Curated annotation (Swiss-Prot), chain A:
EC number: 2.3.1.48
Residues of the full protein shown: 159 to 316 of 316
UniProt keyword list: Acetylation, Acyltransferase, Chromosome, DNA-binding, Host-virus interaction, Metal-binding, Nucleus, Phosphoprotein, Repeat, Transcription, Transcription regulation, Transferase, Zinc, Zinc-finger
A GO MF term: RNA polymerase II core promoter sequence-specific DNA binding
Protein name, as recorded: Transcription initiation factor IIB
Record's comment describing the protein's domains: The TFIIB-type zinc-binding domain is necessary for the interaction and recruitment of RNA polymerase II to the core promoter, the formation of a fully competent pre-initiation complex (PIC) assembly and basal transcription initiation. The C-terminus is necessary and sufficient for interaction with the TATA box-bound TBP complex and for the formation of PIC.
Gene designation: GTF2B
Sequence repeat spans: 60-136
From Swiss-Prot, chain C:
Illness association: Trichothiodystrophy 6, non-photosensitive: A form of trichothiodystrophy, a disease characterized by sulfur-deficient brittle hair and multisystem variable abnormalities. The spectrum of clinical features varies from mild disease with only hair involvement to severe disease with cutaneous, neurologic and profound developmental defects. Ichthyosis, intellectual and developmental disabilities, decreased fertility, abnormal characteristics at birth, ocular abnormalities, short stature, and infections are common manifestations.
Full-length numbering of the shown residues: 72 to 146 of 291
Quaternary assembly: Tetramer of two alpha and two beta chains. Interacts with FACT subunit SUPT16H. Interacts with ATF7IP. Interacts with SND1. Part of TBP-based Pol II pre-initiation complex (PIC), in which Pol II core assembles with general transcription factors and other specific initiation factors including GTF2E1, GTF2E2, GTF2F1, GTF2F2, TCEA1, ERCC2, ERCC3, GTF2H2, GTF2H3, GTF2H4, GTF2H5, GTF2A1, GTF2A2, GTF2B and TBP; this large multi-subunit PIC complex mediates DNA unwinding and targets Pol II core to the transcription start site where the first phosphodiester bond forms.
UniProt DNA-binding residue ranges: 1-75
Protein name stated in the entry: Transcription initiation factor IIE subunit beta
Annotated source species: Homo sapiens
Localization annotation: Nucleus
N6-acetyllysine carried by residues: K3
Family: Belongs to the TFIIE beta subunit family.
A GO term for molecular function: DNA binding
From Swiss-Prot, chain F:
Primary site of residence: nucleus
Name the UniProt record assigns to this protein: Transcription initiation factor IIA subunit 2
Lineage: Eukaryota, Metazoa, Chordata, Craniata, Vertebrata
Function: TFIIA is a component of the transcription machinery of RNA polymerase II and plays an important role in transcriptional activation. TFIIA in a complex with TBP mediates transcriptional activity.
GO molecular function, one term: RNA polymerase II general transcription initiation factor activity
UniProtKB/Swiss-Prot annotation, chain H:
GO BP term, pick one: transcription initiation at RNA polymerase II promoter
Residues binding DNA, per UniProt: N9, R45, K60, N99, R136
Cited function: The TFIID basal transcription factor complex plays a major role in the initiation of RNA polymerase II (Pol II)-dependent transcription. TFIID recognizes and binds promoters with or without a TATA box via its subunit TBP, a TATA-box-binding protein, and promotes assembly of the pre-initiation complex (PIC). The TFIID complex consists of TBP and TBP-associated factors (TAFs), including TAF1, TAF2, TAF3, TAF4, TAF5, TAF6, TAF7, TAF8, TAF9, TAF10, TAF11, TAF12 and TAF13. The TFIID complex structure can be divided into 3 modules TFIID-A, TFIID-B, and TFIID-C.
Span covered, complete protein: 159 to 337 of 339
Source organism (scientific name): Homo sapiens
Name of the molecule in the record: TATA-box-binding protein
Amino acid sequence: IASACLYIACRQEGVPRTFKEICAVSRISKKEIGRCFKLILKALETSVDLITTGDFMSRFCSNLCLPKQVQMAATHIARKAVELDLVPGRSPISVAAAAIYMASQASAEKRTQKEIGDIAGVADVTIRQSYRLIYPRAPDLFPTDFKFDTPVDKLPQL
Amino acid sequence: LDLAGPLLAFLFRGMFKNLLKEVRIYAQKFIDRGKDFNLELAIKTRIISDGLKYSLATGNWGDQKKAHQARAGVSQVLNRLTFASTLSHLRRLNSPIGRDGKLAKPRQLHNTLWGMVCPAETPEGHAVGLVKNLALMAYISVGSQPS
Amino acid sequence: GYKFGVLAKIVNYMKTRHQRGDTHPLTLDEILDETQHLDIGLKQKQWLMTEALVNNPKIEVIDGKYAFKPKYNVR
Amino acid sequence: TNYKPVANHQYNIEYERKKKEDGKRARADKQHVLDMLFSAFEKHQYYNLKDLVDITKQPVVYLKEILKEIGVQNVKGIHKNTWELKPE
Amino acid sequence: TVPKLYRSVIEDVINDVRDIFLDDGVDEQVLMELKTLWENKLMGQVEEEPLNSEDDVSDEEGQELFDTENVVVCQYDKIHRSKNKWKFHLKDGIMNLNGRDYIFSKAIGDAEW
Amino acid sequence: MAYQLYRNTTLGNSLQESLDELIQSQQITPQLALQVLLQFDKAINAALAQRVRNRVNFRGSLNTYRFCDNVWTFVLNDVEFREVTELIKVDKVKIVACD
Amino acid sequence: FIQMSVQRIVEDAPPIDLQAPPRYLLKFEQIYLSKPTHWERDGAPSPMMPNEARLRNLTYSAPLYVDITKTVIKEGEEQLQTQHQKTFIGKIPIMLRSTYCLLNGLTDRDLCELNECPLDPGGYFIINGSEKVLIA
Amino acid sequence: SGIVPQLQNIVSTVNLGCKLDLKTIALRARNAEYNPKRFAAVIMRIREPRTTALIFSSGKMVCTGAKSEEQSRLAARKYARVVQKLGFPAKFLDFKIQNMVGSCDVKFPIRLEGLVLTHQQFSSYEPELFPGLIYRMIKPRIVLLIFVSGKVVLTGAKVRAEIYEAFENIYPILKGFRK
């Protein structure tokens, strides 16, 4: 109950933490935390705003030690991908991880799929799927005034 | 003279003893249940964090539960009325009050204070001779191994 | 241990007989055959007969053959 | 790298796997449970319910019912009131 | 191969029963005679209570009664089923197919229901 | 008082028949025969566990299955026992498993 | 204190022995201390300047990490040794202008750019934005 | 609307009115399995209805997997007849359909974000836990799993009328969030 309440408090304060992030600090499993979260929402008769990719960008990029420009590029890429509906049904965390990978590979500070998955709580395979979904339109997703250390055409294909 | 280092070392030793105590308790519960334990979950960071912060903030030097026997006045708000006041506060010394002080009065300018403690600087009132200031070139040994 | 749970099993068998309803008393050797007590030593059986069967209040002795007392329990 | 997000803790999944593989203790027949109880009493005169449950490998409620049928709880001045496997 | 394994099993069995033959006080010639004979032998229904409204809703039960067909006896480590198929991690065991015997350590099986 | 799996096979049947012959001849007591069967079960279990180091595969269809007291009683049809060295075809098979 | 005493205290702390059968041994090996850092509500770490701490009523503290080796003896004749690198155990308030403060080795121009008086001697702690000095 | 949900699974409970021996049923039945360590009931399967039934020692049985109400009732009767053929006095008492599951497709992608924003009182969308949005209809007590692909799964219905009514209610709402 306490872990689910902590997750709900983060969501309500507007700095949501992933269920995996909460589980990492709580002895309770992610499944139990989610079940208690649903029950708490029903009991309180309240609601929490849907999470967006931009919610986790600051924390993920800071933990990856990426530049502010790379963080902005990743946030823009994720938001534009959601707007264009290139990742339907995909989890916001997965979309954010894929966008961060794209930005990191396009910038000097390059981070591996394993690294991004470790910080974001998302499997490298899921990151691969989301990145493959957003890769075809990478030039469209990237911000206009972005300094590509690696040209968008030569971004990793996978 | 117990400077910031040794005092913080005493506090940190106490808090680390505590930290290992809760680590033992948490791990023991899981071991008794037969399931392995997560080391990261076993650690309470607030022990060290809040202990150091509370000691330095309140000035009661010791565990917040043992404030009765915890030394007081060790930590004070830096005096910023003047630069000279700030320097004096940073070079201040505090004499003890207890059996030693009762048996021998430290409210006096002992000959040994030459070159070590300022002979003129001392508060007026109940603190005369108990609060002292280092001489300009006085240095306090930081300690090293005798090996 | 040895030679205690077997006695407990015999006494439980007597309760099972009484849930059956066979008022007629039965021979101890036949009870042993039914309960697979042949393996047990004979001397323990003799000690049971001499001491424990009489001590047990539920058990009764009629015409040299041991069985519960139909008078003790309410009918 | 500390507190990296994780769906479930390794110790928790290992313990859950052990529990699932072991499975809940089954309610065996009264005759077999009684025989096992009588065998245990032969080894030891006095048994605590917690260890007797481990020996019998039966549900606590079912074992308590069968043990209430025959054995009796004796209050002790040394440790605590415990079961007595002797029917009398 | 299988006969050689059988001979090794014979050796193990006789060695394992020697101690019992000493415990029971029986003479050792019994084991020799046993081995000799063993080798020789080897080589709108509103009122729904009545269920009779349906008939022939079963199959022939004589297969298990017969058991004459080929039979496999082994131990199972894992057996999983997903809505159509049965999967088999059967470990070391024995098989009796067409009289001839087969020996195995790991057996993997997939079947449909 | 053991696993008692291989008794209903060719080997166990031959052993049981031999014990029956000796019992008819009064050479061995039935308790001795039962002890021999128990020792045979132990030895055969150990022998199959240790001296067998070959893997087998098989496929087919299942017609019936049963489970009780940790005893599976599968009944398959048109089974193909495939091995790297040889392949065997069988119209029907009954797989009895225990653990 | 920071360089010698913390590490020596951790080393001198007896290894944790647990058993209740498998037995676990926990040993604390090495101390790591990062620069004073502040975490925003979103969870993004960022270096905490002393002026920022003073203005925002923060505590000028540095994260503290220990290397912890856990060895489990299962009684099965194999022992599993796993090392957790830089496990966070708390934060230590940092004396300003010390070797572990952000204003260490900075030129007067850098201090001015950071809005810190070059004449400020440091030697104190910022706890909840209050400059605390430890009296000898 | 032109679309009708099709049932994927029906759960029905029926009391046989007599105590049973699970071990005997496991030993004598054809497709039955009994693992008291795992579960306290006996799980049996019949292919021709293509359904699975759990039988308890209390005499109550649960039948699942039936795609139709008639199939569920017939399968329950068949299981009861099998138990009866095993010699028990099994009967068919208080047969009831406890829950029905239906599935369908709206044939267009859906914006679950807009749907949850509009119907937060009934909607629950947590991609972390489950990609499908859970909608709790009140007038029918039906839970709908709506997916971005357009697939909709309704559950909690006691009768097919509830499934159809719930889909009729939800379809106009979904049409307003067509992607």
